[PDB]
Amino acid sequence: TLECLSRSTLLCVSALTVISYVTPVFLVALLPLAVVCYFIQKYFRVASRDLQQLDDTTQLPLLSHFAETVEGLTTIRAFRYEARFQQKLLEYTDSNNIASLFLTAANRWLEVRMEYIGACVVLIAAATSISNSLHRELSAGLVGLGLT
Amino acid sequence: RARFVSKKGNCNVAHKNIREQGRFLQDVFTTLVDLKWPHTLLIFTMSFLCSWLLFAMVWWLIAFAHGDLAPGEGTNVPCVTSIHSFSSAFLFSIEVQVTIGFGGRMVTEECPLAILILIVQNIVGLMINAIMLGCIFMKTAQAHRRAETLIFSKHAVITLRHGRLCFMLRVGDLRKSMIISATIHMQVVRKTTSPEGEVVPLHQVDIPMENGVGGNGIFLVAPLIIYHVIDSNSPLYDLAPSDLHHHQDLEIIVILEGVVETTGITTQARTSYLADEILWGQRFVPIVAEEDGRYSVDYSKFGNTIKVPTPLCTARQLDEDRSLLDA
């Protein structure tokens, strides 16, 4: 995880440096998008932390209930208490599901927001580099570098 | 069977054989306010178009009689300039009634009957314009659509409260505007036969709303339960749980009146419960719940009316049983 975090941070910094070297004007638009990115990242991080802790903590009651039902199965069938225990299981599994579902929805929210920021970055880079490769002397291949 | 008032306040009575002495249109003005907004639009536009057509009529007529529609322009002075047709006359009339007056066809100092007509045209224009302004101000301050959002529970329930049979409904004010000084009147509409031999077909007996102050008035922000104690000396005293079916001659109308907070005009919302609408042995489900930091009202459960064990018998028998248990 530390290796992959290093690689991700350095690749992102490297891509931003490349498309700033190809396009000096993009750097002016980078700061608003950087601010938006930071805010989104912070709000996600806090929400995802809470949701992950909750999603973990609701899974222990489910496995625990399964263990109990297997241990005292003959007793529960003796009491004819099967319906109550099935109700308790539905409740536990619904808590687990709603936790996992909200977790995945926050994940999707973050990833869509980051992909839209990336789309705005690619539009700005494309437009400005093409404009400079038309009006100015900016080379042809540097435009493709910044584009990728 | 017919009811007295619909569930939406629309009263169901039909009035027949009304000798009118012209009194329904001697009040042309509230008639012209109560004309629905499309009808008011059409009256508005008729009263403008007809005026313009009238005074354009007069203008073209004058310019005719003044010899101003004959060619040979340069020698004589027009009574108003460059009216060439009834089109020109119609445009000149519009311009002087609606006061745009481009001035391409302006009245000149030449012939007085035009001066007099233009006085008349301005004055009647001012008159009808102020008449319509005022009528549609009165129509901008109509508060019928505000009483469309004061709602009553579809089912009224009779339940045992504090040892006595009580007839309850629930009402709610959807908007933030406090309909100031709300007052509720409830009447049991039922055919009453008199011991002296008089039967009235839509008799209305007011039933007292139970208040600690002994009045008829509510502070309506969160939906509240309006209940009436059926102890005695008021109708519904002999209301057995069996007599609550469809074809029972029994209705209860409720009518709440109060000024709207904003346009400062009194309004009224009313509804009716027939003998089948009113349920027995139910109690209204709670609505207010203390949320994060406020009193959140859930309107989903507005008229759910959970059932609860109540003694199914008449209130007179309830008092008789209490008296027998006491002695």
Partner: protein, 592 residues
């Protein structure tokens, strides 16, 4: 200065002596009118309503009209583009080219906003205002089509295709409006229908309103916003999180699965697989469709970079048709590199939202499957006899259902990664000729190597888990009897034995870490080697075509797009066989 029909031959473009309706740039002016009508009828109402808690309701045809308006905004961006491109020639800017289409754009956006306001407020009679609009927008566009046809504009030019697409889309929206007016008769009629918004949306406590939003919010998870903001101020409690909607409950999914099981029993592991299909295949193939569309639209990127760099690396329009108006064709249009840029942007945005929506639908169907399977195995626990392994059932709920659910997470990938790799190799070959096949073979070689490395890594993981379990038992011995050990100071000797076991575990961890390092290095180095061999062999060995900026950078972007599926295909296949074993075990258990 800023003439609608640009000042030409002393503004000869305005002379309508020829039968007004067949004077272009007047029929183009007629379009500006219905869009002004919509804007100006709506903005007052929208701002009076913009000046409670609703539990909104959807009008029928909802998703369809959203899709249609998305396509509409797309064609209108294309029309703005073709116009602005189409009057680069002359000296005066012909506004009638783009300003009417750019006006229709804002009009369409207002249309979606206004319809959404009406949907939320359930005032269907207001929809009459849209009922007019499309009509006008239909008519005036058809009038624009017909007259085009008269001068034999034809299909040869792009503007004609775009205006035909527009006529079609306005016809579609008119049909949808009349559909709405037909189902729920809100216009002067018997006024019969009141839909009573769904029950699960009225539960104060169902805060996961993902199914109950308009398609745009469904795609952007826009609702989450509110939640997350709240989740930032005060922590998240089981009261803050809602409870599941009726569509995704343990009981609902369990009954669906049981109906599927009855249908399959009317016609073993195969029975369970076919029942899971019959129960969740609609959502599964919907997610797969989103995923494949996202794959193709992501491939739409490198080819667009190719086009852009080929245009600008060159050094640079005919068909003036409407007696002065120029008409750019599809071939000049797709080679402008300003149009290409915004088309890349639109395609990228749409592809990424389709990809995230595929992910979400797959996740949701997997979680519903987990719920149903848990309830089923518990209902089977209820009935099994006392003759029969508690921990086995506990982990069957803990790890086997987990592997099944993760197979259902990655299941769209299983179908859309081969398609991705195939189309990527094909596009690379089409761009770079024969050397691209060598490069693509070199990069495809990453997948089997990664699979082998993962298998060796799991083997090392088991061999490490053995020593880890033994060291844990020794640590537990040391920690239970710590009192007696400290009483006779035997702590150092037991610590030395624990350290010997730790050294053996480190001996195994060395091999585990070597396999992990090999994985990382292969993953990052196979693409570099692929690019190297591709380009060098293209230039030196093959003596092939000269390496142009467009061709080379298109191939580089295609390699970057090819990296990920080749790396994750190993994991997808491993998860598939793992979940196959899990379903086998689950059938073996459920049969007893």
């Amino acid at each position: 200065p800023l003439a609608f029909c640009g000042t030409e031959n002393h503004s000869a473009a305005y002379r309508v002596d020829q039968g007004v309706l067949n004077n272009g740039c007047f029929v183009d002016a007629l379009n500006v009118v219905p869009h002004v009508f919509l804007l100006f009828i709506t903005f007052p109402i929208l701002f009076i309503g913009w000046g409670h808690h609703s539990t909104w309701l959807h009008f029928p045809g909802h998703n369809l009209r959203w899709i249609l308006t998305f396509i509409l905004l797309f064609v209108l961006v294309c029309e703005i583009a073709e116009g602005i491109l189409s009057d680069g020639v002359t000296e005066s800017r012909h506004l009638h080219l783009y300003m009417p289409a750019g006006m229709a754009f804002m009009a369409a956006i207002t249309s979606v906003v206004y319809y959404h306001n009406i949907e939320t407020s359930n005032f269907p009679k207001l929809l009459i205002a849209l009922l007019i609009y499309w009509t006008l927008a239909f008519i005036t566009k058809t009038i624009k089509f017909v007259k085009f046809y008269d001068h034999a504009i034809g299909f040869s030019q792009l503007r004609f295709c775009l205006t035909g697409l527009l006529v079609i889309l306005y016809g579609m929206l008119l049909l949808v409006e009349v559909n709405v007016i037909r189902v729920r008769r809100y216009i002067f009629f018997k006024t019969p229908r009141e839909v009573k918004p769904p029950e699960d949306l009225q539960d104060l406590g169902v805060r996961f309103l993902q199914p109950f939003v308009n398609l745009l919010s469904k795609g952007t998870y826009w609702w989450m916003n509110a939640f997350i903001k709240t989740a930032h101020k005060k922590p998240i409690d089981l009261r803050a999180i809602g409870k599941l909607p009726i569509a995704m409950r343990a009981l609902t999914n369990y009954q669906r699965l049981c109906v599927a099981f009855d249908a399959q029993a009317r016609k073993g592991a195969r029975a369970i697989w076919r029942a899971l299909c019959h129960a969740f295949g609609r959502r599964l193939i919907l997610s797969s469709t989103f995923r494949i569309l996202a794959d193709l639209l992501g491939f739409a990127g490198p080819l667009c970079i190719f086009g852009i760099v080929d245009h600008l690396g060159k050094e640079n329009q005919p068909k003036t048709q409407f007696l002065g108006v120029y008409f750019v064709s599809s071939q000049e249009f797709l080679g402008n590199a300003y149009v290409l840029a915004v088309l890349l942007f639109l395609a990228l945005l749409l592809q990424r939202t389709f990809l995230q929506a595929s992910y979400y639908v797959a996740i949701e169907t997997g979680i519903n499957l987990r719920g149903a399977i848990q309830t089923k195995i518990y209902n089977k626990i209820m009935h099994l006899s006392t003759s029969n392994t508690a921990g086995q059932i506990c982990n069957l709920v803990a790890i086997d259902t987990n592997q099944l659910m993760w197979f259902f997470f990655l299941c769209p990938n299983l179908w859309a990664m081969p398609v991705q790799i195939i189309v990527g190799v094909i596009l690379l070959y089409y761009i770079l000729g024969v050397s691209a096949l060598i490069g693509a073979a070199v990069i495809i070689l990453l997948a089997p190597v990664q699979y082998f490395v993962a298998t060796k890594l799991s083997q090392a993981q088991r061999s490490t888990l053995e020593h880890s379990n033994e060291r844990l038992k020794q640590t537990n011995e040391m920690l239970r009897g710590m009192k007696l050990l400290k009483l006779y100071a035997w702590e150092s000797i037991f610590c030395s034995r624990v350290e010997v076991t730790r050294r053996k575990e480190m001996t195994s961890l060395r091999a585990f870490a070597v396999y992990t390092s090999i994985s990382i290095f292969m993953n990052t180095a196979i693409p570099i080697a692929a690019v190297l061999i591709t380009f060098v062999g293209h230039v030196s060995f093959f003596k092939e075509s000269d390496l142009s900026p467009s061709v080379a950078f298109a191939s580089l972007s295609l390699f970057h797009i090819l990296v990920t599926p080749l790396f994750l295909l190993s994991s997808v296949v491993r998860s598939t066989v793992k979940a196959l074993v899990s379903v086998q075990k689950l059938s073996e258990f459920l049969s007893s």
